[PDB]
Amino acid sequence: AMEKVQYLTRSAIRRASTIEMPQQARQNLQNLFINFALILIFLLLIAIIVMLL
């Protein structure tokens, strides 16, 4: 029974490199994250401004 835990770890960091090789999926999926973050930040920002008053 080999560890294989170490390998997964090495591959885990590789992703930091090319977590998403596709030049489209890298931005499309990330776009959702970025866009998805804007919705969260915008909603959170109004809350703070509203609460600020």
CB 20 within 8 A of CB 32: no
In whole angstroms, give the CA distance from residue 41 to residue 36: 9
Q: In which region does residue 52 sit, left (phi positive, over 0), alpha (psi from -120 to 50) or beta (all else)?
A: alpha
Q: Which residues of 9-20 are buried (b: 16+ CB within 10 A; e: fewer)?
A: eeeeeeeeeeee
In whole angstroms, give the CA distance from residue 24 to residue 14: 19
What is the residue whose two structure tokens read 């959170």?
Answer: 44
CB 15 within 8 A of CB 6: no
- What domains sit in the chain, N to C, each tagged with a CATH number? 1-53 (1.20.5.290)
SS3 content of the chain, % helix, strand, coil (to 5): 80, 0, 20
Q: How far is CA 49 from the centre of its chain?
A: 26
Question: Pick from 46, 17, 19, 45: which is nearest to 33 by CA?
Answer: 19
Structure tokens at 52: 């600020």
